[PDB]
């Protein structure tokens, strides 16, 4: 079991992008056998992102949107990354741009754009995108109020994004 | 007021809403948010929705038929009927159903080629179980020659909850 973690660090060192992102995330939270390190997380994420991995880009965007002493907070490079991610089209990126257009974070407030981004994320099962979309329907922000739309997306979010999510969690 | 929503769903299912029939069916199948475990109402909702063309309803039926109960008397041949209807429509649960069927010759002749290809189709869709089956086959060289790295890829996917982003979703379920 320890060998599997070291094997992964080995494959990541040799350019396995999947391994870089996976490990990046485990250091970001502390994991299977992995001790938590934001340093190692940011470094892995830069590796995979420079290789073009959309998930890595989005993780960076997050770390810049919510800055620590290792990654100092900056909404401008968080935007840079959410936009690279979203172009490809990663739901986390789509959500990020969504928030930016909803609240004018580094961009002019634009409710249609927000709406379309949250919808794109929401379709891909991204619970947050669904929550955001639900709020906009509930509060009639991007659109005219539809409590039932809100109900649909809130329901999806509560199921974990998809009716089958339970079963994936049932084995995790 | 959650009860009012459960009743609102009962209302929508009763008026032909396929999603609501399937959703409530699932809640009755396991026992859930405000809902009592009831295999009978589960089976009725699943039949209602399957007749309407819903792949999830079909797959659920396939499941309670491969795995018999007192309500649903076991028949892996109709379990196969439904897994095949679901799989025809891209449903990962169905695809996985055929996969098991071919892996272990349940109501069908053993065929590792088919098991492997059905598990691939389901795994592609983030379905943790299909990823596990596929991983097992590569790891123990069942359908093909042992491919430790393939095995590893799918085990990793499974361990992440089917997708690297899955943890973030499943944390809010």
Residue numbers in the entry:
A (entry chain B): 353 to 524
B (entry chain A): 352 to 524
Paper text:
SEL1L, the mammalian homolog of Hrd3p, associates with HRD1, mediates HRD1 interactions with the ER luminal lectin OS9, and recognizes substrates to be degraded. SEL1L is required for ER homeostasis, which is essential for protein translation, pancreatic function, and cellular and organismal survival. Previous biochemical studies reveal that SEL1L is a type I transmembrane protein and has a large luminal domain comprising sets of repeated Sel1-like (SLR) motifs. The SLR motif is a structural motif that closely resembles the tetratricopeptide-repeat (TPR) motif, which is a protein-protein interaction module.
We found that the central domain of SEL1L, comprising SLR motifs 5 through 9 (SEL1Lcent), forms a tight dimer with two-fold symmetry due to domain swapping of the SLR motif 9. Crystals of SEL1Lcent grew in space group P21 with four copies of SEL1Lcent (a total of 82 kDa) in the asymmetric unit. The assignment of residues during model building was aided by the selenium atom positions, and the structure was refined with native data to 2.6 Å resolution with Rwork/Rfree values of 20.7/27.7%. The two SEL1Lcent molecules dimerize in a head-to-tail manner through a two-fold symmetry interface resulting in a cosmos-like shaped structure. Each protomer is composed of ten α-helices, which form the five SLRs, resulting in an elongated curved structure, confirming the primary structure prediction. However, the last helix, 9B, at the C-terminus adopts a different conformation, lying parallel to the long axis of helix 9A instead of forming an antiparallel SLR. Helix 9B from one protomer inserts into the empty space surrounded by the concave region in the other monomer, forming a domain-swapped conformation. In this interface, Leu 516 and Tyr 519 on helix 9B are located in the center, making hydrophobic interactions with Trp 478 on helix 8B, Val 444 on helix 7B, Phe 411 on helix 6B, and Leu 380 on helix 5B from the SEL1Lcent counterpart (Interface 1 detail). For this structural geometry, two adjacent residues, Gly 512 and Gly 513, in SEL1L confer flexibility at this position by adopting main-chain dihedral angles that are disallowed for non-glycine residues. Notably, a single-residue mutation (L521A in interface 3) abolished the dimerization of SEL1Lcent.
